[PDB]
Amino acid sequence: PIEYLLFEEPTGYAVFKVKLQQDDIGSRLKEVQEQINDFGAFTKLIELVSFAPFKGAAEALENANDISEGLVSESLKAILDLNLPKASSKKKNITLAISDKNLGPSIKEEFPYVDCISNELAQDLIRGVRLHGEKLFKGLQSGDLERAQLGLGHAYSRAKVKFSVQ
Amino acid sequence: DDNMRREVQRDLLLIKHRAALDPKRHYKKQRWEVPERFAIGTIIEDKSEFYSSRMNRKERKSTILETLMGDEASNKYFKRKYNEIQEKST
Amino acid sequence: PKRLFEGNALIRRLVRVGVLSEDKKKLDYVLALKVEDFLERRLQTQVYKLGLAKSVHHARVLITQR
Amino acid sequence: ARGGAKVVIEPHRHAGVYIARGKEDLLVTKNMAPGESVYGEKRISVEEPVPPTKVEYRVWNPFRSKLAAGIMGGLDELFIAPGKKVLYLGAASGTSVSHVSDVVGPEGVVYAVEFSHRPGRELISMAKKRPNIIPIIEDARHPQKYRMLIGMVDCVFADVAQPDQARIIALNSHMFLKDQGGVVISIKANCIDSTVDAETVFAREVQKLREERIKPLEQLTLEPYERDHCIVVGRYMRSGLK
Amino acid sequence: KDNRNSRVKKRKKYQKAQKKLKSVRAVYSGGQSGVYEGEKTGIKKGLTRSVKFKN
Amino acid sequence: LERMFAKPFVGQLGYGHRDGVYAIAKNYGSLNKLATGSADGVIKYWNMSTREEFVSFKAHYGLVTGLCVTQPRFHDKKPDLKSQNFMLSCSDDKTVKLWSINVDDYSNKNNEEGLIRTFDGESAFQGIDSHRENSTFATGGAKIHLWDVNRLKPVSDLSWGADNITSLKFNQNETDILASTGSDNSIVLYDLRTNSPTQKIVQTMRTNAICWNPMEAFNFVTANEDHNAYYYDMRNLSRSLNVFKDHVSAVMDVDFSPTGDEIVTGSYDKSIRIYKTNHGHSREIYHTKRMQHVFQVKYSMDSKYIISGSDDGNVRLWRSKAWERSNVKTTREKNKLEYDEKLKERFRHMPEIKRISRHRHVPQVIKKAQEIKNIELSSIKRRE
Amino acid sequence: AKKTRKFGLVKRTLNTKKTRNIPQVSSALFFQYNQAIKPPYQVLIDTNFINFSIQKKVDIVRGMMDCLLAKCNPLITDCVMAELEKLGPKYRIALKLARDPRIKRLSCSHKGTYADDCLVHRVLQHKCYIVATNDAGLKQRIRKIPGIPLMSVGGHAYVIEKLPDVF
Amino acid sequence: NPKAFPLADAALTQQILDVVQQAANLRQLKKGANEATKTLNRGISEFIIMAADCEPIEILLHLPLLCEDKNVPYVFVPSRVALGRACGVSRPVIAASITTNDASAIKTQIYAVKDKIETLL
Ligand SMILES: [Zn+2]
């Protein structure tokens, strides 16, 4: 019961709809771990649904800072509001797989009909998505992830340190 | 390649026989067959080691063999050792 | 009662000898003691450590030299 | 020794590093920003054949780089290659991350991770003179705090001294380390268990790796450079440790 | 004379054994003394002095 | 290919229990979670996805005789069903204890770890189960008591007469029907809406355990010490629907697959057997040199796996069908596999195929016991 | 190669004729001293050891305390545990012992279940343990290793062999 | 000011200054910013004590860089004149280095103070 997952990226947020569930007990087995590595089987387990790209470098930077501190940004708020179905706020909440335990509560207190998950299974799904990366986007236009990462890392670190031209 | 070939061959042979340049060094026992590639080069100090390790301008010789010549204690030790090894050969 | 009396005696004896540190006042650390600890407490070692001597044999000699 | 003698470069066994022979040998890596030495190390220059260009080398100082000491002692399978993306846990400054950069080359990247701010600042400077490094000044116990910035490294090298070293390594390897990945750990026994001794600390830490699903491959006690240190090379196996 | 005095014989024996140990396995002595002169004794490419975890 | 791909054993759960396993209870809600308990007195709450354990309480001074896993319905509050799970141990030293477990299933918060409540008893308790969707448990010691979570005194007394009661089980559907097994080798159905025992059958030997089935709601199956498992209809208790046969010592536990068509039994002989509800002979036998006296068996809520607690102290877990790897299968492969199964169901009874697909290797103790038992039955039959 | 050809060539021969890896020595070891085994010790238990202990009625933990006058942390590897298990029902008592809360278990990523091989590797690798047994073949191999103390069971209580500080 | 971040309280200052005087007596202590930096370069330092009211603070503030680069514990204490007394010299000292020597009598003290410094870091 892992209906959706959220994946943050240097160029914006992505949201995937889980199609099948890998069996929960067998997860430590050679066979399911290999299907996470392989690309053919990961597509059977996951299809992308949404992708909101960041506006510019500054907006990406502050968004990464808020992800670090564990808050929800305006952009994340919007994309979740758009993708996630509205179930009853009392029974049958919708399951979303995130990467950060500390991100959980903020998402909840913004969306009381969603339930975050960071399990062994959800961490495996995040890992597979991160491994395959751009092949999963079916061609949706994304910046070069590696250059994005270099720029973002440098900006993040300079921000924390207070690097100065003086 | 086959220019500067004589000088580079001398340097390579010297390095292969480096165990005998000094009575005080005693390197580990390795064969050192000549590599397929290499590129002899210069060592550059930092500005902060000008007395400790910076070498000179007039002691800068274009080859390890000729700087070995320029050093003097090496020269007298070599000529001595060669003298007695020759007298034992004879 | 026997354990308590005799054990406390043994621990304070070792602590005052200097073998055992203050913070390890427990019979378990007593079990963890060793020969190097006792030798480190000997006098010649202490001279050499405090610096009145230059070697352990210099120290030995001094001590017996009065 | 002195910065005049003439040396003979040569390839090492490990792709990416070189041996400089002479009256006495050295370990070297090709520079990437030729013309500057990041921490004052004597640095070789050769010529490469329009006028020929000058290619510049740098020297590993084994008493300063734990990886250098490991290389010089002799590690069978080092996992840092001339094209691979390496995560680096604990880069105080360029003293060894710059050399890992020089050995991964222009293709592979290197994610330097540090916690404090002063060496972080100089790490930023070096990392901006060098393209491969991306510097991250986040704590190394919170990969979720810097997960936007790293993707699927090939091997992690670890030089954190913290006692909870193996937990740190497990977190970061699970979260970013590709499968069948390389892990190199630098263990400092005094700074893990100050009371019990070094062989005990090593055996304990090796078992902790064997727990967190890294099959350790080899183990080296790097003596004549550092006192009571070790580096363990192991393989993240992630699926059937057996 | 190393039989006339006992502890002298043990002293000299210990010094000799210290040297032989320095031969058997690399021993830690201080660290770098001057500036990094270079590995005075030679780098061997194909030795691999490390303990391997067999299966 | 089936014979060369049958690889049942899939792995065990951590380092195990010190002193043999005697209580297992799967969480009927989730799928990772089970709770095991040992004659040491130490109960553990396993995460089977990672083969790890959440906690490990030293619960009781004596044996742990029963485990239930649940969520209570307190009236003081509503304990978080999402951050914590709850577990209920039923001990031999006259206590019942309710524990909390901190479960990582959701990531949706950020104290109160263990032993929420203790229910003192007057007797030694001997089995436990908990009526679902009502938070009401029932414990069989010397007289079965219907307890509520919020009252420390057993709410209701159910007992035919003055006999102790070995074991209990509620049923899955029409959930007010309880069945119980008593040591004057009796099987007694209880109903909770009228709040009374309902009927009684007495067999020739004691029945160790009973499981309703979760798809028919009036059939149950009892593991019985005369080497057998008897499958009964509830409304007509005069006769057994079927008898499941192929064990060679006391049967010790049974469980229904949630699909409702297969049964898994574990005996005091050291083996596991899997049956289909319609046949009456074993489909499959699981056995190891390191597993002994299977005392507890639980079939998994995805129907895919089997957990077996054995008194060598280990909680192994096996595949329900020894083939079906857990990976996801490309549609071509899936069609080929279903085609395989259909074809062999068609030709099941041809002599060559039957010889090959029935050849399964069994321990020498079971082989010899089986031929002896056959000899004795022939003897009985011809003197008759 | 005929016989006379071979003989002739042997005659003529007589007339005419008249990456590697060498593991580093452990930094713990003085020449054979092994100065890295200070109390509290760490003892790798073995199957033979458990069974002989049951035979001679010596407790594990208190027995090693007696033998060494220190604390002894005993450790059981996965191949030692699985060997006891396969031994089976007749050794139910040895297993209920070895599976004690104080016997901490250290795992392994190694093939099959041959505790001899598995043990000898541990002590080749680390040299902070002391091996416990009564098995002759393993005893011989461990003696061949330098500086590894060997605690056998014998007589009425455990004996220890290569510890300089047996007392 | 967080620039002198780890600043010892009264008790830790007591034990620090006591081991500083002990090391000055057994002559395992290097006194002064420059000599401290020299020991730091040579990697012979067990740990570093600094003053917290230097005029100004940066002149020794350079040290924490090398300290936490090479993993050598460092700690600030309130008064440089107190540090000078503790060292046993006629003039106020601002930064001193407790060196490392296996053949020392004060071994266990230095290790206790270094333990607590690391905990505080
Ligand atoms: Zn093993």
**Which residues, listed in sequence order, are joined to residue A47 by a DSSP beta bridge?**
A17
Instruction: Using alpha carbons only, give the angle G27, G31, G34 rounded to the nearest 5 degrees.
Output: 55
Does F93 reach chain G within 8 Å, measured CB to CB? no
Strands F262-267, F251-256: pairing kind: antiparallel
Report the alpha-carbon distance of residue G32 to residue G20 in Å, rounded: 25
Report the alpha-carbon distance of residue F144 to residue F129 in Å, rounded: 11
Please say whether the beta carbons of F169 and F212 come within 8 A.
yes
Report the alpha-carbon distance of residue F260 to residue B58 in Å, rounded: 97
Sheet bearing D110-113, strands edge to edge: D133-136, D110-113, D86-89, D153-158, D177-188, D229-236, D214-220, E51-52
Six token digits for residue D69: 């000491």
Residue A113 has what DSSP assignment? T
Q: Which domain holds residue H81?
A: 1-121
Please state, as a whole number, how many other Cβ atoms lie within 10 Å of the Cβ of residue F113.
Answer: 12
Report the alpha-carbon distance of residue E55 to residue G121 in Å, rounded: 9
Which residue type does G65 have?
A: M
Report the alpha-carbon distance of residue F271 to residue F268 in Å, rounded: 8
**Cα–Cα separations (whole angstroms), residue D211 to D117, D166, F9, F45, G109:** 33, 10, 21, 20, 9
Nearest-CA neighbor of F234 among F319, F297, F158, F171? F171
**Which residues, listed in sequence order, are joined to residue F69 by a DSSP beta bridge?**
F87
- In residues, how long is chain D? 242
**CB-closest option in E29, E46, E49 to D73:** E49
Collapse the DSSP code of F101 into the 3-class scheme (helix H, G, I; strand E, B; otherwise coil) and give the result: strand
Six token digits for residue C52: 């009145």
| Neighbouring subunits of C (3+ Cβ pairs under 8 A) | E, G, H
Interface E–G counts its CB contacts (< 8 A) at: 42
**Which residues, listed in sequence order, are joined to residue F56 by a DSSP beta bridge?**
F44
Six token digits for residue F349: 């009874």
F307 contacts: CB under 8 Å, gap ≥ 6: F24, F26, F34, F48, F297, F298, F299, F300, F315, F316, F317, F318
Resolution (A): 3.8
Report the alpha-carbon distance of residue D121 to residue D126 in Å, rounded: 9
Six token digits for residue D214: 């890294």
D125 φ, ψ (degrees, to nearest 5):
-60, -50
Q: How far is B82 from chain D (nearest CA, A)?
A: 21
D87 φ, ψ (degrees, to nearest 5):
-90, 135
Which residue type does G118 have?
A: C
CATH code, domain carrying H46:
3.30.1330.30
Residue G102 has what DSSP assignment? T
Chain C hits for G69, Cβ within 8 Å: 31
Please say whether the beta carbons of H36 and H48 come within 8 A.
yes
Chain D hits for G38, Cβ within 8 Å: 196-197
Nearest-CA neighbor of F252 among F275, F232, F225, F212? F225
Helices (H), D149-228: 165-176, 189-192, 198-211
Nearest-CA neighbor of D43 among A153, B86, B45? B45
CB-count exposure of residue C32 (10 Å: 0-12, 13-18, 19+):
middle
- The string of DSSP codes covering F37-87 is EETTSEEEEEETTTTEEEEEEE--SS-EEEEEEE----SS----TTTEEEE
Nearest-CA neighbor of D110 among D130, D140, D88? D88
Buried b (16+ CB within 10 A) or exposed e, F172-195: beebebbbbbbeebbbbbbebeee
Whose tokens are 């200070």? That residue is G38
Please say whether the beta carbons of H84 and H92 come within 8 A.
yes
**Phi-psi label, residue F246: left if phi above 0, alpha if psi -120 to 50, beta otherwise:** alpha
E33 φ, ψ (degrees, to nearest 5):
-90, -65
Q: How far is D116 from chain E (nearest CA, A)?
A: 27
CB-count exposure of residue C37 (10 Å: 0-12, 13-18, 19+):
middle
Report the alpha-carbon distance of residue F222 to residue F187 in Å, rounded: 9
Report the alpha-carbon distance of residue A124 to residue A118 in Å, rounded: 10
Compare all CA atoms of chain G with the CA of F292 and give the residue at the minimum distance.
G89
Report the alpha-carbon distance of residue F157 to residue F136 in Å, rounded: 13
**Cα–Cα separations (whole angstroms), residue G48 to F187, F199, G83, G136:** 48, 56, 10, 10
**Inter-chain CB proximity G128 and D215 less than 8 Å:** no
Collapse the DSSP code of D168 into the 3-class scheme (helix H, G, I; strand E, B; otherwise coil) and give the result: helix
Helices (H), chain D: 66-73, 94-104, 118-129, 165-176, 189-192, 198-211
Q: Is the dihedral of CA D231, D235, D237, D240 positive or negative?
A: negative
Report the alpha-carbon distance of residue A47 to residue A68 in Å, rounded: 26
Helices (H), F278-363: 331-346, 351-358
**CB-closest option in E46, E52, E55 to G111:** E55
Which residue type does D125 have?
A: S
Domains of chain H: total: 1
Instruction: Using alpha carbons only, give the angle H5, H10, H15 rounded to the nearest 5 degrees.
Output: 95
Collapse the DSSP code of H117 into the 3-class scheme (helix H, G, I; strand E, B; otherwise coil) and give the result: helix
Q: Quick check: bond before G40 cis, omega within 30?
A: yes
Nearest-CA neighbor of A24 among G145, F302, E22, G154? F302
Report the alpha-carbon distance of residue F170 to residue F28 in Å, rounded: 13
**Cα–Cα separations (whole angstroms), residue F357 to F245, F341, F353, H76:** 19, 12, 6, 79
Strands D18-20, D26-30: pairing kind: antiparallel
Which residue type does B76 have?
A: K
Q: Is the dihedral of CA H67, H73, H78, H80 positive or negative?
A: negative
Nearest-CA neighbor of G151 among G84, G37, G64? G64
Chains C and H touch (3+ CB pairs under 8 A): yes
| Neighbouring subunits of G (3+ Cβ pairs under 8 A) | C, D, E, F
Nearest-CA neighbor of F39 among F77, F13, F65? F65
CB-count exposure of residue E31 (10 Å: 0-12, 13-18, 19+):
middle
**Cα–Cα separations (whole angstroms), residue A31 to A46, C55, D18, D98:** 17, 67, 41, 39
Does H115 reach chain C within 8 Å, measured CB to CB? no
The four Cα atoms G157, G161, G162, G163 give a dihedral, to 10 degrees, of 30
G93 φ, ψ (degrees, to nearest 5):
-70, -45
Distance F169 CA to ligand 1 centre (A): 43
**Inter-chain CB proximity D138 and A68 less than 8 Å:** yes
| Neighbouring subunits of H (3+ Cβ pairs under 8 A) | C, D, E
D105 φ, ψ (degrees, to nearest 5):
95, -160
Q: Is the dihedral of CA F243, F247, F253, F257 positive or negative?
A: negative
Does G143 reach chain C within 8 Å, measured CB to CB? no
Instruction: Using alpha carbons only, give the angle G143, G144, G149 rounded to the nearest 5 degrees.
Output: 30
- Distance, first Cα to last Cα, chain A: 54
- Distance, first Cα to last Cα, chain H: 16
Please say whether the beta carbons of D45 and D54 come within 8 A.
yes
For an interface test with G, the pick among D12, D14, D200 (most G C-beta atoms closer than 10 Å) comes out as D200
Distance D216 CA to ligand 1 centre (A): 13
CB-count exposure of residue A52 (10 Å: 0-12, 13-18, 19+):
middle
Chain G hits for C40, Cβ within 8 Å: none
F215 contacts: CB under 8 Å, gap ≥ 6: F258, F259, F260, F261
E strand map for B1-90: 42-44
F33-36 contact pairs (CB < 8 A, 24+): F33/F69, F33/F85, F33/F103, F34/F69, F34/F298, F34/F307, F34/F315, F35/F67, F35/F69, F35/F87, F36/F67, F36/F309, F36/F315
Please say whether the beta carbons of A156 and A148 come within 8 A.
no
Chain C hits for E18, Cβ within 8 Å: none
Strands F165-170, F136-140: pairing kind: unpaired
